[PDB]
Assembly symmetry: C2
Homo-oligomer: 613 residues x 2
Amino acid sequence: GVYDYKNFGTADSKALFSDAMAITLYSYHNLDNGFAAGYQHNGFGLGLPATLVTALLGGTDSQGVIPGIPWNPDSEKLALDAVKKAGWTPITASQLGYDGKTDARGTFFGEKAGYTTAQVEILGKYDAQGHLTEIGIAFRGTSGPRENLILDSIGDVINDLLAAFGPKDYAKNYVGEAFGNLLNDVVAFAKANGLSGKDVLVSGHSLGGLAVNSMADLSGGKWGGFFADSNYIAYASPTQSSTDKVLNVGYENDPVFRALDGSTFTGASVGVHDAPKESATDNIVSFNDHYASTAWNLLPFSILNIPTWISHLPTAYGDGMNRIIESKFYDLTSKDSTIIVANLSDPARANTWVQDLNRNAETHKGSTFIIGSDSNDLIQGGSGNDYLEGRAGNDTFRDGGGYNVILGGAGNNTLDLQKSVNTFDFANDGAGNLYVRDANGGISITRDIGSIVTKEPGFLWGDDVTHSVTASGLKVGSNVTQYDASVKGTNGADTLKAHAGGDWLFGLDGNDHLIGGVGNDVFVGGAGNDLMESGGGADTFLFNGAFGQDRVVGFTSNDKLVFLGVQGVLPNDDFRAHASMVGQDTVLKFGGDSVTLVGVALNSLSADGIVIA
Amino acid sequence: GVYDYKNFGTADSKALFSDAMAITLYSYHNLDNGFAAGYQHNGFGLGLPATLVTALLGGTDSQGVIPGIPWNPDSEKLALDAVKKAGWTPITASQLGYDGKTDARGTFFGEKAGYTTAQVEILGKYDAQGHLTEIGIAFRGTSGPRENLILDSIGDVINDLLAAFGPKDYAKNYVGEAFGNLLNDVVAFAKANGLSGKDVLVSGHSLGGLAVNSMADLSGGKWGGFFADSNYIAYASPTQSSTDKVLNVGYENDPVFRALDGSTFTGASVGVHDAPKESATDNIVSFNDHYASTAWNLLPFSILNIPTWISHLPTAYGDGMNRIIESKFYDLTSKDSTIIVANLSDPARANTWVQDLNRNAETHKGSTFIIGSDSNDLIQGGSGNDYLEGRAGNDTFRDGGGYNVILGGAGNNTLDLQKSVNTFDFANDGAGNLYVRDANGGISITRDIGSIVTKEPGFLWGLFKDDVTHSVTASGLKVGSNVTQYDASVKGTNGADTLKAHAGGDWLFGLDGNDHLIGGVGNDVFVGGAGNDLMESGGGADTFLFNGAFGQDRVVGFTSNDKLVFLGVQGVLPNDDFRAHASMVGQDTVLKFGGDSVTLVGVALNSLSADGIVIA
Ligand SMILES: [Ca+2]
Ligand SMILES: [Ca+2]
Ligand SMILES: [Ca+2]
Ligand SMILES: [Ca+2]
Ligand SMILES: [Ca+2]
Ligand SMILES: [Ca+2]
Ligand SMILES: [Ca+2]
Ligand SMILES: [Ca+2]
Ligand SMILES: [Ca+2]
Ligand SMILES: [Ca+2]
Ligand SMILES: [Ca+2]
Ligand SMILES: [Ca+2]
Ligand SMILES: [Ca+2]
Ligand SMILES: [Ca+2]
Ligand SMILES: [Ca+2]
Ligand SMILES: [Ca+2]
Ligand SMILES: [Ca+2]
């Protein structure tokens, strides 16, 4: 998964992640709530003035920067309710025996001159019998309490500037100078509750992402080494620690994120700074109204260009990245997977195609994941290999080519092929998958998409035609575009045999024996350990999901293997990364799943006969 | 005067400038009205969020950036009405026979791709019979009509960036590209009406300042040389044309003003770029809440720090610089005079002293002018020479020493000396001038200050200090039963007088008329006043005060232990010493200040020393 961490598996990494996000969101106390709401209703162009009104005064359903407006919700109490729902309760200065500053909310404040506008939250996770099981440490980014916002922010900005322009280790020592004492009292508190360093999660966003990396840098030497094996997940940090301890998560179009290298100011710092970084997720795009805008991007991408900071705001971090966590494609992803997160306003969502523009960023490689919203989206895949997820709402998909998985989600979803129905082949396995094969051999596996739009010039001489996806073909009323010749199996073990003319063969679940003929067949073994025999001709073998340990017989020169939505594909992996000889057979391994090409020598294979997506 | 332009002289360059400002303000259509009104109420600190709310939404007495809010006044009708009160009526596309684009307000829009967000107003002044007498051309700075604010602003800023980072001469050609055809129609429309270039005023703020400079650069060679003798007054321009045609007016703490040199982006462009520039007013400060604030100024001054942009906003340009135009000190000032303008919010004004902090600027030289508001101000003159102006409102002054003029204005005004009354001498000519002399000989001439505050030794034998308020009366400073006496005086009349000092030493007040002031062996202070006066020392260590239009005077007996003091006199350029004003005429040294002069009978110029001739 993109957020895999240390040697925690997929699931434990995600749980860690969601906690870090939750405690990071709490540390801001819903300050950008008003912005988020104003933006969602108004956008970031014509209606940007109105978005900004809401950023300051919120509305009936949001609180902006100004406190005590009666018709606003109590966003701060919602912020506390939210963190508790996640399992976290602030630990009082009283429980730690801390003699430093806190405010009425229990927020801890930096200890030394020049660090007094620093903020951190210390939080506990308690079990059923009420024992402490985990400590959360969330460092607040730039900004402070609504009561002292401007003055507090000015302090933070001096600190930010010192990170870039001051003592060489300024950023590294930030947490030592700000919370050295608080953290000794935290070490004592954990000990007293039977907790070690492994039971501590450290998070924060922006300046607080800097703090995360600071503590990681200091953790080997300070606090008696107690925090050395703690969990560090930082969001939108300008810096990266010199350790291997920190997961640095951000949107590649957030200009704050990785602004420094790892704390060095460079020429890149005030422009695009998108070089690959070991600690960072390199390729996550917040597809927001700014990113999508042609007008906005006539201006230079720069941390100095304030409008670009929309991509920095923490609510879109929490909302967009949560949907990456929930995604059906999640386990396909890794740290540097290209992922496009639908983050448009309501009015831009109505007329803007979410797509990989690759704006202001190094060239994206490998497959692309586009993650929709729970509202009606317009999603456009590229000409390469795509994973498009609609989620809820009535979504419409386009895609430019290659090898794709398109999941409609809930709602009434539509795939717009933009071309004549006659340039495609359709098949359906009877188990919720519609296969679309285009004139170039690219295959899309589609689910929950009930309408296909095609352009028919020589029926509508100037021309969209809408086909329903049914068990008997694609239908325009009573008129049928037939699926390609198929043999459908069951979720039991089946023997399936192709006709001489070629068939799509659908094992579905169970260990199936698929017997090709002299024709060009398409083999979909399905889940389970399948035996597939070519029988001659130019055959396609397609592998998707947790496909099993398959055996392929009679595979030749003119045959194609297709891997799509399978485990362990690093950006731009080719077949060689997954292939070995075992005996006389070539095996291709994808996570725990495998294909054995019986009697085929590794050296006879060509990347053009082997598609990895 | 600070805004003297070409050879129009004091008064006509003032009226020119007020015209330039009036049309510059119109071009913005009151876009910053809600900010100005928000700032005045809330300030720029704790109140900054509320200030921005008003900037966007206005209120019941202002319109912010957002159109169509029921309870706002029509700030765009107010702007039209204001430009009309100023004499101007926008000229229509039909009158010009212009085939380009205009919007519902008559505003003209740029002509070519990449200039479509440029805006200009073309206006006409008409006489009593309705004949065109003048054309005004007012280019809009960054921003556009409210209906399209953001997208229009993005275009403008792209233009700003190309001014710095684009083709050489991008700024020079901007008006050529944006409005080349419009200008041809304007030439033809002016010729049609009997006008030449000299009847054209060109103005604009920010990017419109850049546009003033572009048009000046191009005027020689384009549109047939027609506007080569036009009038060019640019506000807050980041650039300066390569010509001698443009008055570049700006606040020195405005980060946009002079950002480029004169079109070149340098290291200083992103910081302080306060180098003297021939075409520009180098030393005018907007004393606003940002400038005042120690916390804000922790942050580096840069066009890249958006808060510093408070000093850029047009209403504070119109309002501050109008007070400059109106000042009783106006005609003392020149292009590079140090001038501090009171621009504080209502909450900042009650507790912040207006003073020359010299923040984020080259060291200020010469006398300092501090201009107040029509509210109650706190004004702090420096240890050098100051001209302090309260205007209306109940004002309070402090001043750190030197030679000063302090005009209280209307209201109940107070001079706070911050030390014992015993360290000052006081004199009064009976004509409204109260003179305050400190322990070092520094003189302040004050008018319309009815209260003097002193800090006196108090309880426990001076451990504690008392603040005592004295009333200025005919017989002295008075506190209850205690009178602080004026220094011994002889007062003349507004006709010709002969006045004689007693040997103990007197202040000799000639007043109007040509007076004969006879000093004695004591230390006298001579104030010939208006008219041509004859003043003889008599010996001792004497002081001769010259202020205003002091006439042609003759001083006899001036020696090495005497002192001349020029205060509030014409033609003192920043940091002038006497040598810029001194010549020999036969046996006599002559000092000249505009049309006024002092002749030091039989003193040789080369025996003089700056110690004995104070110029302020
Ligand atoms: Ca803070
Ligand atoms: Ca990237
Ligand atoms: Ca694709
Ligand atoms: Ca959706
Ligand atoms: Ca859907
Ligand atoms: Ca089966
Ligand atoms: Ca199977
Ligand atoms: Ca076959
Ligand atoms: Ca299988
Ligand atoms: Ca504009
Ligand atoms: Ca200056
Ligand atoms: Ca002074
Ligand atoms: Ca006043
Ligand atoms: Ca007289
Ligand atoms: Ca006289
Ligand atoms: Ca004498
Ligand atoms: Ca005289």
